[PDB]
Design a protein around this ligand. Structure first.
Ligand SMILES: C=C1[C@H](O)CC(=C/C=C2\CCC[C@]3(C)[C@@H]([C@H](C)CCC(O)(CC)CC)CC[C@@H]23)C[C@H]1O
Lengths: 237, 10
């Protein structure tokens, strides 16, 4: 049985995601256009920049998040942004041809497109494997939103100060999730589903680390960092 | 210092 509090948490997170993820992708017309050797860097930098803004807007709505110091909010968002972008992108990802399909041909991104943003298969191959293994969980939208919120409120991000508080917020989300699965996810889809979802959070840490390495390498060249956005530079370094 | 992230967080 989901308590009243746990049902509330899910309603809040569903709404927060609905208010921050336009599944029609209408705002993509505002990005510098896709061109198809770092020819996708302007478009994809704009997409990621927009996505960071949407991730922040979702985070602010996570119950308990606002109770954190303004400093702990910052550290959590800086370290998780790329991971929550990779998670929320699973909604446009399609196993049909292993691409992110955002409404139209111009806005359909494949392995070649990511490599034309400056990344290598060292990143891209595990990223597609992650997206595939995530889609294969066939998560309920309730689970998807709890996983993103649990990803953001992680007490072990380096620089976190009030870890005991971040832990308490996350536990209340983790318990909600464990209870949701038990109450509302029918077998066989439910079999070790929580353990599997937690495994996706570890896979994201490894994705974050390789993304960071390639981003530092990309952005060290002032001519590439010139093509990024002020928000990407601020959040990614 | 993260002025833009700070502003977006309210
Ligand atoms: C609204 C959304 C749609 O589901 C589409 C989304 C797709 C996310 C993607 C697919 C293409 C390649 C992206 C941008 C990845 C790459 C490695 C980021 C590239 C980067 O390092 C970002 C600064 C250089 C342009 C991260 C997430 C990936 C973001 C998501 O927020």
């Amino acid at each position: 049985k989901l308590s009243e509090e746990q049902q509330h948490i899910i309603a809040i997170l569903l709404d927060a995601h609905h208010k921050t993820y336009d599944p029609t992708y209408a705002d993509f017309r505002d990005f510098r256009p896709p061109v198809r050797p770092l020819s996708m860097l302007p478009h994809l930098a704009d997409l990621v920049s927009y996505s960071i803004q949407k991730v922040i807007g979702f985070a602010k709505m996570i119950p308990g998040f606002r109770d954190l110091t303004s400093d702990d909010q910052i550290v959590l968002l800086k370290s998780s942004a790329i991971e929550v972008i990779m998670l929320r992108s699973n909604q446009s990802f399609t196993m049909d041809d292993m691409s992110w399909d955002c409404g139209s041909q111009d806005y359909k991104y494949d392995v070649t497109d990511v490599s034309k943003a400056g990344h290598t298969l060292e990143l891209i191959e595990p990223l597609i494997k992650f997206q595939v293994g995530l889609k294969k969980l066939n998560l309920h939208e309730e689970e998807h939103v709890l996983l993103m919120a649990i990803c953001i409120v992680s007490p072990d991000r380096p620089g976190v100060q009030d870890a005991k508080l971040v832990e308490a917020i996350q536990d209340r989300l983790s318990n909600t999730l464990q209870t949701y699965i038990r109450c509302r996810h029918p077998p066989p889809g439910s079999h070790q589903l929580y353990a599997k979802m937690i495994q996706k959070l570890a896979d994201l840490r490894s994705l974050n680390e390789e993304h960071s390495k390639q981003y530092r390498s990309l952005s060290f060249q002032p001519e590439n960092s010139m093509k990024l956005t002020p928000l990407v530079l601020e959040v990614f370094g | 210092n993260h002025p833009m992230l700070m502003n977006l967080l309210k």
